[PDB]
Design a protein around this ligand. Structure first.
Ligand SMILES: Nc1ncnc2c1ncn2[C@@H]1O[C@H](COP(=O)(O)O)[C@@H](O)[C@H]1O
Ligand SMILES: Nc1ncnc2c1ncn2[C@@H]1O[C@H](COP(=O)(O)O)[C@@H](O)[C@H]1O
Ligand SMILES: [Mg+2]
Ligand SMILES: [Mg+2]
Ligand SMILES: [Mg+2]
Ligand SMILES: [Mg+2]
Ligand SMILES: [Mg+2]
Ligand SMILES: [Mg+2]
Ligand SMILES: [Zn+2]
Ligand SMILES: [Zn+2]
Lengths: 320, 308
């Protein structure tokens, strides 16, 4: 990650309040969960215009901050190097604002714009910036849909730097002991590059909503009581009929749509017959290594920053 | 291999689920306050020591509970691996709850179940626990209704945003947790810690929840450094263990420290130390003024994996 989350500061109201108006503090502005970005404008993002975060400071956002009931403020962390309250730490916050306010901003700064739609525009951000966006967007998305207490239905209030919501009903069981109802949600999702029993093909599928010709790795949410490997085997068989043996973890990608942790795996199929569950996917097929090589250089796959692309590209290079 | 095929394709088949409720081969697992009904001994597996196993009930054992649907919670677990033997979990109230008994307390008594039965309890307990604490719509606060064999809750307010599109507010929660065996730079020691609440002498792997926006490996590095001050480099995934307290997925990793100095937070972790392979070997066998979780806990499996 690009920041140190400094979760120990989340219950330090005085420190958080002081940092809000400190001149070194960085703000990332969000409207309807979309981050404010800019194209080009420095050396790295120049040779072809690259999308980068529009980093704001207190003088840019002070008017939003002075209406706390209309904003959602999340402490993201501090920069990894300290500069020469006044502790040398450079704080970052995510600031979610109302649409009226965002319009008045868009007329104020012409070079910055809100990134949308989230898929695939978030894949345009460089890795370090994409990670902080995934943190900020996932927490703001949680706040947008978890305003009421799941245990009793009452209103809740934000606490702990944006990382906790607390029911206002004093008698509520959610307030006795520690419960996940207080805290942001992380949904684990397995996504799997599935290799044919003969090592020369891989299994890819699509949903009816996908652009014509796009195919990608099968994926699904891990269920309660399931391991990573269990979910890979179950989801592949559900959607495509294919039975899976060995499952190998490869890498992760946080995917803030709203709050998914993509757990990327390589899996070896032990059967070949395909039986598509139309209620989930429209199509699943075996693609030869040669076909996939042709496409990485009559179907196509997600862009290179998507984990599915990284899994497919990794496989193309493995020893058959 | 597993006890059950989840057959999630059946969860929206209300006619099939209903037919199975009274079928003579259907098995029910009874839960009181999220604790499973179990039994000790009584088959070939206990010829040596009495072993805990699930107390499998059938329709005539639970039919009085089913006659009061507003007082129970019913979850379709799957079919054994139409000839299909359906399993359900049935959560009841403490009042309604002599060779069976409710397994309590969950830590460490759940660790007495054999792995294949532990997997079914983790499924059932976590879904039941979700229903206990997620009865209202997080998006608007209205009441909700159970659907899909116990795997969905649906807001009763027709205009609610939760009903336009697909949203995680409808579905069971799974909380990813990293737990990590952390090896000293010199390769000869591992880092273990404890909380004040722990029984005296107990040490275990550090662990913590993955945050929004974070990878497995970054959560390991962040939590180790938060809790113990130790900085971590390489992180390797090893294996998982679902832990239904209420709904955690323990993601077990081996990590290499790149610093040596410990600095404990004295808020979550009251103590953390480097333990040599010899100290740990002694404690996996039996001799040391400390001890670790039992063998079915993923921390014990990770510590064992490390010593070879
Ligand atoms: N946490 C969640 N967020 C969104 N959808 C979920 C979640 N858990 C289960 N689902 C269901 O999972 C479906 C997607 O299938 P899959 O991604 O293959 O598991 C969605 O259409 C939902 O019905
Ligand atoms: N899903 C969750 N369930 C319970 N506690 C959580 C959750 N997410 C964050 N927390 C917090 O994490 C603390 C435990 O620390 P750790 O397990 O080391 O991350 C709890 O006491 C809560 O304050
Ligand atoms: Mg899927
Ligand atoms: Mg699924
Ligand atoms: Mg699926
Ligand atoms: Mg911890
Ligand atoms: Mg911790
Ligand atoms: Mg933590
Ligand atoms: Zn409440
Ligand atoms: Zn609602």
């Amino acid at each position: 990650h690009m920041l140190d989350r400094r979760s120990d500061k989340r219950n330090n109201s005085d420190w958080l309040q002081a940092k809000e108006s400190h001149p070194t503090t960085v703000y990332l502005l969000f409207s309807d969960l979309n981050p404010l970005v800019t194209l080009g404008g420095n050396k790295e993002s120049s040779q072809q215009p690259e999308v980068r975060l529009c980093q704001l400071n207190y003088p840019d956002v002070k008017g939003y901050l002075a209406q706390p009931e209309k904003i959602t403020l999340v402490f993201l962390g501090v920069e990894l190097e300290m500069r020469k309250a006044a502790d040398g730490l450079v704080a970052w916050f995510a600031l979610g604002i109302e649409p009226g306010a965002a319009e008045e901003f868009k007329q104020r700064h012409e070079n910055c714009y809100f990134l949308h739609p989230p898929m695939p525009a978030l894949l345009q951000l460089k890795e370090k910036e994409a990670g902080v966006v995934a943190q900020a967007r996932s927490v703001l998305a949680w706040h947008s849909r978890y305003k009421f207490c799941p245990t009793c239905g009452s209103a809740t209030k934000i606490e702990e730097g944006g990382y906790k919501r607390v029911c206002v009903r004093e008698t509520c069981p959610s307030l006795q002991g520690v419960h996940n109802t207080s805290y942001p949600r992380v949904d684990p999702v397995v996504i799997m590059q599935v290799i044919h029993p003969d090592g020369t093909k891989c299994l890819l599928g699509r949903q009816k909503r996908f652009p014509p010709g796009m195919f990608t790795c099968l994926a699904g949410f891990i269920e309660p009581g399931e391991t990573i490997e269990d979910a890979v085997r179950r989801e592949v068989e559900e959607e495509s009929g294919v039975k899976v043996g060995h499952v190998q973890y490869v890498s992760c990608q946080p995917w803030p749509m709203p709050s998914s942790l993509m757990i990327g795996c390589l899996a070896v199929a032990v059967s070949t017959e395909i039986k598509v569950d139309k209620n989930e996917i429209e199509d699943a097929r075996w693609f030869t290594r040669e076909q996939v090589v042709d496409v990485l250089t009559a179907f196509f796959v997600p862009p290179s920053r998507a984990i599915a692309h990284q899994l497919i590209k990794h496989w193309v290079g493995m020893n058959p």
